[PDB]
Design a protein around this ligand. Structure first.
Ligand code: CLA
Ligand code: CLA
Ligand code: CLA
Ligand code: CLA
Ligand code: CLA
Ligand code: CLA
Ligand code: CLA
Ligand code: CLA
Ligand code: A86
Ligand code: PQN
Lengths: 187, 741, 189, 73, 40
């Protein structure tokens, strides 16, 4: 039984077919050591934080800014908000949600036999529905947003520049934008 | 997962029912008192959990909950010092001038004329002078404000309440099973990493971010009320970079292994800070970092749930040789099934550690302006000496208790314990010969010096102007330490301590630390120390080894750990128990520690402490008389005791009069001890009978019949009174002497 | 499984909360699990005492911001120290301490299990809840008012010190400006 | 964590990690002792890599700091 | 209080400590109000 992702490594025995997002990708066999619901808790918390972080970073960089906030880029927004003295106030909703939800949920994941799964906070106010197709969409967007925020921060620190976070803008993304004469000179 | 948490739920109901039934823990005392011996037996057997229950699990649970209660008491004791510094002290006025203001954090109530004890400690304050050194300890942490002391006291009260709750919780709600306590590898890993290494790491972090900038600004001359608050220094790379120009690079050189960029605040310069006469705090933070890394590294050694790690059973059983038979086999079961063995090891380690602390904190003053505070240095040295001596006696006591109770011959056949027990006469004989040789030599040189000086023959003495006894090995070691920076400590600026030779360190006239010269008197008193330590070892080791049996009494283990005798038979079997050996060895511990602290006090007052004037003129407290007067017993009697008791006997009518009162009272208690120590039970029982006749005549006979104290209790009372009187007399004498000069 | 109907990613596996509906307003809100280590009756008594104290405190804070007795010419934030120096707070402490010593004896008898429900002293002279059908409803109203008054008093003292104004406890730009402005805002108010 | 543009610093730490991992020993089992890779994956799992990289990082830190004090990096 | 906590408070050491504290307090307050009395 080989894994679906790695065709030459054996399949991890803790990932059968359930738990949406299962591509059979687990080298290091971390599912054997870390409990699987705890790992889903951590993955989905990271996913949601990274989604909100990507959208906030891009939104502040594009120019959207609420009144009385410092009109700076998202790279310097952290230091500007700390210097203004209001960025500590964001901790109180974070402290409320994280303590009073995550701490009992983490303890019940580790201790209680029957408990809700990792991302299952049962939030759902509108009632869209937690279908198996929607969970796959959530976790795919979350993994994409994690890699995206990593890349966005690492490139924005290197360039200190505008939204594309490359050294020459979107022209680095599209090589036909940049001097196709040299390409034509060899045809 | 072998290492797991297994816990019983609600084992013991919380009720005020056995509170009203004293003596409930034991079978004999629970039936009610008939004589006035049940009271003393109730007090003696309160903490002897091994005689109350035969289950090791319940004993371990009681031990754990009692540890929590003890930690609560210690947290309250930390909170008292912080609160008295916050509200009842002159700590701010001491911060503004820590060389002329005497620390004081204890004020008395005027009711009976005792308001004379509120002496003029300086700074517009009246109170009792403090020799604890808490002021310098707070200054080393950057606690320049009096609000932080108050909040530290409040946090200490909160932590004490937490420990009280935890102690109730782990005995009445969630008491761990026996398999939880026996995870000694897990306990060892968790202590070595999480307690020691993480405490060192967190304290180094606090030092680097708070105490280094605040103490640097304080030594720069900035007044404490214009110094940035520690929370303003914690998150300000600009201000720290102004102070230490390495925070500009941030945490990047730490992760790139370019640790040489952090040499601004992590140094190995050594020596003493000239401004404060103490160790450099950068050296202290670097020291704590090295310790944190070492301890966290050491905490990864023993096997837990995962396959890596060591088993301590396999390490011990592999260490065996030809001359020792089976080696360390069976010691793992001994130390995982008995608490008394763990006490016997841990008390010895803690006493030796306290003695090491005493020897290290005087030659290496670690707190600012603590070296020029002579009462603090003397009090800390003598304190840690007495604590170490008491703990090292208790180690032998619990080794004897283990040997009487928890020893098993089937478990410990032919291992190290068995081989030690099979030749104990050779050990005790050779240690006896060493004690006699050391005593005859070390004391007879003093007596010979007394005789030569009394006969008018100073040229025949054992002195530096006569037949010399130079400690050549100690001088060679001192010369090796003085030449260490550059040669064997190449990245070092100064020596480890100036006691090994070097330069005199002075802070505002007073001497912080200067080289200590060793002569023939130092040789003589070091041999006295070795002899006293050897005799204490002889008594305690003879008590431990002969705890089970001897040639005199073959069945001593069947009589118990403590028992008065085995009758007047065999010529007399008085004080044969191992308890009586601990009782006899406590006196010799007292003698040894008294001689050690007398040596320290006289040598430091004579050759180190003093003043410096223009052109480096050194004037010590006593005048350098230790070299020629510490060679005779008359010299000790006349020049130390008689000459330095003048401060304690003339303290009446001044702020030090409580020291004279305690001097007289401790003499009274010490003499009161000999009443119990010399007399015997039967005389007191007959006198009690004569008193009971008068009581019976006046219809006043108590139903709880009055009895004399038991023989073991009489010895214990006499020993406790002797120790209290001696330690009180020395305490009052030292404090009244060193405060007033 | 019986999930808590106030968190519901967590169960009522905090079974120290007891049966559902044993107390009024029981929505199973115990995330940190204080009921595991403490009795429920003592926590309920503390809660109801806090509710009533905070209700009286909120009303007194606002009233002292509006009116005061003659001779008590002190503001609300300085009434504490001024009346301590005057001596009235000693009288308050003495009489409240007498009533609270009686309450201490009451809690001691209740925890040993005499008859008492927590927070019930029988003090209903006007007979509002002498009908047993209206007892269970007025308890919830008392609770909700007490919780809201706890939060209200905390906000009252913190905004009164933070800004330095009377009963609105608002900044100058929130009363002497425009909060429902839709124009392009500046960079300060 | 990575060095500031130093390729020599990277080689010391990676070589130390590889050398430690190949020269480990748990319960008498070791790649150098002639004991196969697949069952050491089976018997230990990620504990093998974690312990090997921890000891390799300690050894590499010591070697890097020593060669920096002498002169190289 | 309780029927068995009061019995614990009725023990000899607790009662001795409480009564000695009361006596010491009474004598100390007498010395505070009527100090330095040699004669009657
Ligand atoms: C990972 C998530 C994340 C993080 C860490 C940040 C971080 C940041 N964002 Mg941001 N953002 C995000 C997601 C995120 N964003 C998303 C998803 C969006 C798009 C919707 C935005 C849109 C956005 C804008 C438009 C702006 C920021 C800004 C900022 C900066 C300052 C924020 C601040 O001071 O908060 C302060 C927090 C508060 C004022 C609210 C605290 C709540 C108070 C204390 C009350 C607490 C509740 C109380 C207990 C109950 C109610 C009480 C009352 C009603 C009675 C900071 C760097 C600002 C900035 O400076 O950029 C330059 C800015 O203008 N962000
Ligand atoms: C890293 C984990 C850790 C830590 C820190 C400790 C710490 C301690 N254990 Mg312990 N223990 C552990 C794991 C740990 N243990 C494990 C895994 C086992 C089972 C094998 C045991 C079994 C055990 C027994 C059987 C006993 C102890 C005892 C003790 C205390 C020794 C007394 C002392 O040095 O006072 C130092 C005092 C302090 C450091 C004060 C702080 C006290 C708190 C509780 C320490 C932890 C605080 C917290 C985790 C840190 C928060 C950081 C935050 C501020 C950011 C000490 C508090 C003994 C004791 O005293 O019992 C009460 C005792 O009898 N332990
Ligand atoms: C338990 C101890 C402890 C704690 C709580 C801290 C905490 C902190 N250190 Mg720090 N530090 C410590 C030990 C500690 N340090 C030690 C032992 C050293 C010596 C190697 C340093 C050397 C050091 C430097 C050189 C700097 C800090 C800085 C900081 C601050 C920001 C770092 C951060 O969170 O980046 C995020 C965490 C990671 C990226 C991981 C933060 C308050 C910075 C500072 O001053 O901030 C204002 C800074 O420049 N630290
Ligand atoms: C880690 C410290 C530690 C611990 C946990 C123990 C624990 C124990 N010891 Mg032990 N011991 C210790 C240190 C320790 N000891 C030291 C340091 C010594 C050397 C002095 C001894 C010497 C010793 C002997 C000789 C004996 C024990 C015994 C015992 C056991 C019962 C104790 C009991 O019920 O006493 C109950 C507690 C008391 C009666 C209180 C004693 C109060 C003292 C004597 C007075 C203190 C005066 C105070 C400091 C100043 C007063 C000032 C004045 C003005 C009022 C128990 C297992 C006995 C036993 O049978 O073991 C199985 C026993 O015979 N121990
Ligand atoms: C000042 C009082 C004093 C003196 C001199 C001694 C002397 C001694 N005690 Mg000791 N002891 C004392 C008080 C004293 N004790 C008290 C108060 C207690 C009660 C707690 C004890 C409890 C006690 C115990 C429990 C033990 C001792 C032991 C010893 C001996 C140690 C071996 C040694 O070096 O002997 C050498 C002699 C001396 C140190 C004293 C004389 C030195 C002279 C000046 C030099 C040599 C003189 C020479 C022999 C004779 C020449 C003159 C002659 C021809 C006229 C030694 C005989 C231990 C022992 O005997 O084991 C070996 C032992 O186990 N004692
Ligand atoms: C049981 C009755 C009683 C009595 C005799 C007192 C006595 C006193 N209170 Mg008082 N107090 C009480 C109950 C009582 N308190 C209760 C239950 C509370 C609420 C918990 C308070 C709250 C309180 C505060 C907040 C203050 C006092 C103050 C005072 C002092 C006023 C000094 C002065 O100049 O008088 C002023 C005299 C008058 C204004 C004249 C009119 C007063 C009339 C004659 C009182 C009526 C009789 C009275 C109710 C006695 C009971 C009779 C009985 C039949 C019920 C005085 C020591 C004040 C203080 O300490 O200042 C020094 C202060 O500020 N009290
Ligand atoms: C193969 C590469 C390499 C090289 C070139 C060095 C080179 C050096 N190491 Mg080093 N080290 C290495 C690998 C290496 N180490 C490894 C693999 C480790 C294990 C992690 C260490 C751990 C280590 C430590 C812990 C220390 C050194 C120290 C030193 C320096 C002085 C050593 C000395 O004189 O002994 C000292 C001479 C003695 C006689 C030792 C006395 C020992 C008593 C008991 C103390 C020297 C530059 C020391 C240093 O940096 O000092 C500046 C130091 O403290 N090394
Ligand atoms: C047995 C010896 C003894 C005697 C006779 C006294 C007698 C006295 N001492 Mg004294 N004292 C003693 C031991 C003694 N003390 C000890 C051992 C110490 C050291 C701890 C002291 C320390 C001491 C100090 C420091 C002071 C005294 C004072 C006094 C005098 C207080 C008079 C008083 O309070 O009357 C008033 C008390 C009463 C009338 C009590 C009666 C109360 C009941 C309710 C009356 C019932 C009547 C029916 C009194 C002459 C004080 C004094 O005035 O010095 C001259 C003083 O300041 N003594
Ligand atoms: C159900 C119900 O009842 O109520 C609902 C109501 C409500 C509020 C709707 C709910 C919700 C859901 C919410 C709030 C969902 C928000 C989800 C969010 C915010 C999802 C962002 C993803 C961002 C991504 C994928 C970024 C990719 C970025 C990628 C892939 C890049 O490559 C970027 C790139 O930069 C790199 C990395 C390098 C650059 O050189 C080049 C570019 C620029 C191309 C709740 C909580 O469910 C409750
Ligand atoms: C005096 C004495 C007694 C008699 C001692 C007894 C009966 C102790 C009495 C204890 C009392 C009752 C405790 C309280 C003491 C006083 C009532 C309070 C004094 C308080 C002062 C601080 C003022 C012995 O039983 C004994 C036994 C073995 C060796 C030596 C001796 C010994 O020397």
């Amino acid at each position: 039984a080989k894994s679906k992702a790695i065709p030459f490594l054996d399949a991890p025995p803790a990932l059968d077919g359930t738990m949406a997002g299962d591509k059979g990708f687990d080298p290091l066999l971390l599912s054997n050591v870390v409990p699987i619901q705890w790992a889903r808790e951590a993955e989905l918390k990271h996913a949601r934080i990274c989604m909100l972080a990507v959208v906030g970073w891009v939104t502040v960089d594009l120019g959207f800014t609420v009144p009385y906030a410092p009109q700076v880029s998202s790279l310097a927004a952290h230091d500007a908000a700390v210097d203004k003295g209001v960025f500590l106030g964001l901790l109180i909703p974070i402290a409320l949600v994280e303590v009073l939800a995550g701490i009992p949920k983490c303890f019940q994941i580790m201790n209680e036999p029957d408990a809700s799964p990792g991302g299952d906070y049962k939030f759902d106010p509108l009632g869209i529905g937690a279908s198996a197709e929607m969970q796959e969409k959530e976790i795919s967007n979350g993994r994409l947003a994690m890699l995206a925020f990593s890349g966005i921060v690492t490139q924005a620190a290197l360039t200190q520049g505008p939204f594309p976070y490359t050294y020459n803008g979107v022209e680095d993304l599209v090589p036909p934008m940049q001097s196709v004469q040299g390409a034509l000179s060899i045809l | 997962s072998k290492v797991r948490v297994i816990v019983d739920k609600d084992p013991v109901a919380t009720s005020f029912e056995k509170w009203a039934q004293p003596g409930h823990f034991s079978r004999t005392l629970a039936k009610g008192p008939k004589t006035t011996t049940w009271i003393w037996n109730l007090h003696a057997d309160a903490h002897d959990f091994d005689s109350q229950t035969s289950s090791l699990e319940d004993i371990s649970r009681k031990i754990f909950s009692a540890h929590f209660g003890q930690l609560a008491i210690i947290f309250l004791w930390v909170s008292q010092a912080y609160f008295h510094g916050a509200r009842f002290s002159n700590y701010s006025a001491w911060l503004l001038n820590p060389t002329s203001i005497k620390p004081s954090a204890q004020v008395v109530w005027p009711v009976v004329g005792q308001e004379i004890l509120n002496g003029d400690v300086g700074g517009g304050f009246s109170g009792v002078q403090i020799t604890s050194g808490v002021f310098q300890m707070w200054r080393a942490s950057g606690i320049t404000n009096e609000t932080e002391l108050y909040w530290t006291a409040m946090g200490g009260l909160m932590m004490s309440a937490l420990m009280v709750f935890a102690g109730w919780f782990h005995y009445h709600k969630a008491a761990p099973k026996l398999e939880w306590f026996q995870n000694v590898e897990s306990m060892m890993n968790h202590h070595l990493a999480g307690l020691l290494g993480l405490g060192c790491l967190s304290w180094s972090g606090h030092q680097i971010h708070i105490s280094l900038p605040i103490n640097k600004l304080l030594d720069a001359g900035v007044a404490p009320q214009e110094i940035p608050l520690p929370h303003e220094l914690l998150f300000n790379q600009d201000l720290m970079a102004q102070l230490y120009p390495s925070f500009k690079k941030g945490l990047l050189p730490f992760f790139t292994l370019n640790w040489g960029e952090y040499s601004d605040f992590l140094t190995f310069k050594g020596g003493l800070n000239p401004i404060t006469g103490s160790l450099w705090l950068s050296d202290t933070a670097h020291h704590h970092l090295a310790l944190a890394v070492l301890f966290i590294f050491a905490g990864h050694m023993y096997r837990t749930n995962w396959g890596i790690g060591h088993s301590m059973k396999e390490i011990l059983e592999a260490h065996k040789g030809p001359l020792t038979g089976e080696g360390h086999k069976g010691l793992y079961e001994i130390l995982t099934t008995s608490w008394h063995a763990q006490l016997a090891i841990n008390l010895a380690m803690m006493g030796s550690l306290s003695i090491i602390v005493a020897h290290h904190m005087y030659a290496m003053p670690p707190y600012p302006y603590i070296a020029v505070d002579y009462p603090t240095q003397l009090s800390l040295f003598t304190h840690h000496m007495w604590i170490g001596g008491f703990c090292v006696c208790g180690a032998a006591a619990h080794g004897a208790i283990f040997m009487v109770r928890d020893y098993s011959p089937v478990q410990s056949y032919n291992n190290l314990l068995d081989r030690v027990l099979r030749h104990r006469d050779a050990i005790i004989s050779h240690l006896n010969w060493v004690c006699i040789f050391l005593g005859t030599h070390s004391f007879g040189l003093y007596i010979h010096n007394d005789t030569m000086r009394a006969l008018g023959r100073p040229q025949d003495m054992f002195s530096d102007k006569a037949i010399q006894l130079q400690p050549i090995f100690a001088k060679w070691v001192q010369s090796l330490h003085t030449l260490a920076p550059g040669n064997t400590a190449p990245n070092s600026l100064a020596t480890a301590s100036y006691a090994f030779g070097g330069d005199v360190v002075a802070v505002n006239g007073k001497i912080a630390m200067m080289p200590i010269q060793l002569g023939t008197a130092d040789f003589l008193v070091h041999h006295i120390h070795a002899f006293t330590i050897h005799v204490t070892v002889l008594i305690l080791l003879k008590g431990v080894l002969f705890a089970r049996s001897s040639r005199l009494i073959p069945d001593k283990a069947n009589l118990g750990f403590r028992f008065p005798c085995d009758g007047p038979g065999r010529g007399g079997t008085c004080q044969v128990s191992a308890w009586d050996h601990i009782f006899l060895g406590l006196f010799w511990m007292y003698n040894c520690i008294s001689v050690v602290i007398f040596h320290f006090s006289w040598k430091m007052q004579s050759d180190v402490w003093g003043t410096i004037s223009e052109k480096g003129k050194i004037t010590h407290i006593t005048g350098g008389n230790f070299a020629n007067s510490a060679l005779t017993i008359n010299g000790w009697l006349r020049d130390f005791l008689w000459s330095q008791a003048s401060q304690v006997i003339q303290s009446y009518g001044s702020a030090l009069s409580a020291y004279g009162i305690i001097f007289l009272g401790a003499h009274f208690i010490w003499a009161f001890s000999l009443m119990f120590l010399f007399s015997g039970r039967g005389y007191w029982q007959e006198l009690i009978e004569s008193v009971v006749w008068a009581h019976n005549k006046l219809k006043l006979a108590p139903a709880i019949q009055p009895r004399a104290l038991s023989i073991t209790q009489g010895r214990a009372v006499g020993l406790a009174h002797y120790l209290l009187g001696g330690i009180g007399t020395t305490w009052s004498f030292f404090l009244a002497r060193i405060i007033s000069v | 499984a019986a999930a808590a109907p106030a968190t519901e990613e967590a169960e009522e596996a905090e079974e120290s909360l007891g049966p559902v509906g044993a107390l009024v307003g029981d929505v199973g809100f115990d995330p940190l699990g204080f009921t595991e280590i403490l009795p429920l009756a003592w926590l309920r008594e503390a809660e109801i005492k806090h509710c009533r104290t905070a209700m009286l405190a909120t009303f007194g804070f606002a009233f002292t911001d509006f009116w005061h007795f003659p001779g008590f010419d002190y503001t609300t934030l300085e009434a504490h120290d001024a009346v301590i120096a005057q001596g009235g707070m000693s009288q308050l402490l003495l009489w409240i301490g007498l009533l609270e010593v009686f309450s201490a004896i009451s809690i001691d008898q209740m925890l040993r299990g005499s008859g008492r429900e927590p927070g019930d002293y029988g003090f209903d002279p006007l007979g509002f809840a002498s009908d047993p059908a209206k007892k269970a409803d007025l308890q919830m109203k008392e609770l909700a008012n007490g919780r809201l008054a706890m939060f209200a008093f905390g906000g009252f003292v913190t905004q009164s010190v933070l800004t330095g104004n009377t009963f609105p406890y608002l900044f100058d730009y929130q009363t002497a400006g425009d909060i429902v402005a839709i124009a392009a805002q500046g960079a300060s108010p | 964590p990575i060095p500031q543009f130093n390729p020599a610093k990277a080689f010391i730490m990676m070589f130390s990690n590889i050398l430690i991992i190949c020269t480990m020993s748990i319960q008498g089992k070791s790649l150098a002792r002639g004991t196969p890779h697949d069952e050491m994956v089976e018997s230990f799992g990620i504990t093998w890599l974690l312990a090997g990289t921890s000891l390799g990082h300690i050894v590499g830190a010591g070697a890097i700091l020593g060669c920096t004090a002498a002169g190289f990096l | 209080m309780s029927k068995d906590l009061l019995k614990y408070l009725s023990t000899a050491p607790v009662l001795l400590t409480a009564w000695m504290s009361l006596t010491a307090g009474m004598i100390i307050e007498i010395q505070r109000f009527f100090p330095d009395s040699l004669s009657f």
